[PDB]
């Protein structure tokens, strides 16, 4: 997911801009987004949210809006228990489990149910599970006493002012997520939000692994308030951003560093090349219009080719294999953009799968390692060019096997297909540098692949008066069988032809195609 908010001073017209841009699976049911507009005499909210949620997480209106990305807030601990004498060892002594006999019904092939017993054991830590390998793990989830998640979001997205927004946020009822805010009064804000246990030792990796379950040393009981968490408001650089990177370059220049916070809140890992592009696209551009803001959102640069091709190509041209030499010349002539008509992109992906791993996040191949001192220009270079040329040899073979050739057009293999709509793909993998993301599936027998994940809901809002906003939903607004509203936006997505989002009553009345009178009698 990506998220941008831009302050009035960084724009041409003087109105803040917001990008909503979550990346989730295109198939997983509970991750499916839905767009809607709710209006009463006392509030108005427009935007998207996961199905089954009664409040809009990606919301905006005439005054303000927010967006979200995953931050991985470590709100739970998995504890390894030491079992002994029917109990578990804890502070020197054996301690018996709480145990409860529950049961549930299980549907049978013949349509009947049978009653199945289920023991539920807990230690002081929490409920106990047994892994296949025999490890007894107790899971301790924070924030189980925070009933107001939905209402917090509801009050945040209907806030009359930034102060009311912050006060709602400060309730700590929403247990995770980076949350970015902007409004027509000119305020922008980034918050690394969640419910994080207060701990007296251990960095994030320690608390992400199995923590010893035999001592009160590691049994946390309190959680941090909002003002202990990384936050940025109206910074000198005039924007905030997050593209799932750790919260250490949410703006530029920065306003804090990792030392300023406990080491268990967020990782200090290298920022993805997409996250590096997020920072560059905002920082290097001034006098932004909504139109330019939108154009920048479509960025689809093979940044990793920028970091590796200078070293890889000459090394590859030294190789006696004429096919490797030809692969090198094809890559050398590529403009390093993931366009539909690129003949080199698929081959470059296959090389990168080996150089940087199947997720493209590997660092060991680089000559110059990532550094927070050069957070948008590292890592860089090819450490061992001879090895990397061998990887290219293998990649050539992989590319031919998957796609039929080393120079099949990107948009001919990469398609977006919903029902009977089949359109050319562009952009791609985030970890290669593409800001606009389409996490292409493995190809079928004919070398055709489609997005498993990536752009879903995309909206860009200028908080002018009235507001102006544009958006698309990759997979439509309906997934019910027979709907005409599943495949009806993907062609527009293939051309980045965004819909004007219609908030004013007169616009809605002009666009209406169906009217459902209702009434609610409690």
């Amino acid at each position: 997911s990506n998220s941008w908010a831009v302050a009035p001073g960084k724009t041409a017209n003087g109105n803040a801009l917001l990008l909503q841009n979550p990346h989730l699976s295109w198939t997983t049911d509970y991750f499916t987004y839905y767009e809607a507009h709710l209006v009463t005499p006392d509030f108005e909210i427009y935007g998207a949210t996961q199905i089954g949620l009664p409040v809009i997480r990606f919301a905006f209106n005439q005054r303000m809006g927010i967006t979200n990305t995953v931050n991985g807030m470590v709100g739970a601990t998995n504890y390894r228990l030491t079992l002994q004498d029917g109990g578990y060892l804890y502070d020197g002594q054996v301690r018996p489990f709480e145990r409860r006999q529950a049961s549930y019904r299980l549907r049978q092939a013949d349509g009947t149910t049978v009653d199945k017993p289920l023991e539920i054991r807990s230690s002081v830590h929490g409920p106990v599970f047994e892994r296949a390998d025999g490890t007894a793990v107790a899971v301790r989830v924070a924030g189980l006493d925070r009933p107001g998640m939905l209402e917090q979001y509801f009050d945040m997205i209907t806030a009359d002012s930034f102060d009311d927004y912050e006060a709602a946020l400060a309730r700590m009822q929403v247990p995770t997520f980076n949350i970015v805010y902007a409004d027509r009064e000119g305020t922008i804000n980034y918050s690394f939000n969640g419910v994080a246990p207060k701990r007296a030792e251990g960095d994030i990796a320690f608390w992400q692994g199995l923590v010893p379950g035999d001592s009160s040393r590691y049994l946390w009981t309190e959680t941090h308030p909002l003002d202990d968490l990384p936050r940025v408001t109206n910074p000198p650089g005039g924007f905030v951003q997050n593209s799932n990177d750790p919260p250490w370059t949410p703006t530029w220049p920065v306003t804090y560093t990792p030392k300023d916070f406990p080491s268990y809140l967020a990782p200090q890992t290298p920022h993805s090349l997409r996250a590096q592009q997020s920072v560059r696209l905002m920082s290097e551009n001034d006098d932004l219009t909504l139109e330019r803001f939108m154009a920048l959102q479509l960025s689809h640069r093979a940044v990793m080719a920028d970091r590796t091709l200078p070293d890889l190509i000459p090394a590859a041209l030294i190789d006696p294999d004429p096919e490797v030499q030809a692969a090198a010349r094809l890559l050398a002539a590529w403009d390093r953009e993931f366009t539909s008509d690129s003949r080199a992109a698929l081959l470059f992906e296959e090389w990168a799968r080996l150089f940087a791993g199947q997720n493209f996040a590997g660092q060991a191949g680089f000559a110059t390692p990532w550094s927070l001192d050069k957070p948008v220009s590292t890592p860089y270079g090819v450490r061992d060019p001879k090895a990397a040329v061998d990887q290219l040899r293998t990649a050539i073979a992989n590319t031919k096997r998957k796609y039929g050739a080393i120079d099949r057009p990107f948009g001919d293999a990469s398609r977006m297909i919903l029902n009977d709509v089949n359109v050319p793909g562009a952009a791609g993998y985030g970890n290669l540098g593409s800001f606009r993301v389409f996490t292409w599936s493995d190809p079928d027998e004919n070398g055709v692949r489609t997005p498993v994940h990536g752009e879903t809901w995309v909206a860009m809002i200028e908080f002018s008066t009235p507001v102006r906003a544009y958006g698309l939903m990759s997979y439509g607004n309906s997934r019910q069988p027979g709907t005409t509203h599943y495949s009806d936006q993907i062609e527009r997505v293939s051309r980045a032809d965004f819909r004007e989002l219609l908030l004013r009553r007169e616009q809605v009345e002009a666009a209406v195609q169906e009217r459902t009178p209702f009434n609610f009698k409690p």
């Binding site: 507009h37 009463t40 939905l150 459902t516 609610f520």
Partner: protein, 160 residues
Amino acid sequence: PQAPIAAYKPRSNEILWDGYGVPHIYGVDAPSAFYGYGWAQARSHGDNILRLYGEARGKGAEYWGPDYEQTTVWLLTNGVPERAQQWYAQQSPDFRANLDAFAAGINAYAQQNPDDISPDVRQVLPVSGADVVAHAHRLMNFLYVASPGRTLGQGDPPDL
């Protein structure tokens, strides 16, 4: 200090749907708008909403058999359905009425359009405010924050 445009004051309850199937729900008050929103979501994503609410009740194994059983064990072991009843009761009166209205909207959609609801998920109806709280609880705390995979030492969810 320029003020925003005048807010629209709805005088009747109606959904004006546009040509891409986006609902613009106008309510004369908050519960009416939440009901409209529940109705719309049931129209657009009804089957999968009911299925998820069924799971968050702890009833996945009971309604749909073995493929849903490990989620049932995860959610019952972590007390999710009962905790959702607690959280529902612990809502403020006003917000509880919005949640009840959302659930009523779902139920009303299904009641007036039973042909649009897949046979396998009909047994889930009616849904309640507490069902809505429960799915939100499972999603935030027991999918996002604490996943079955991390505790049980398994793998990561469907892509490739």
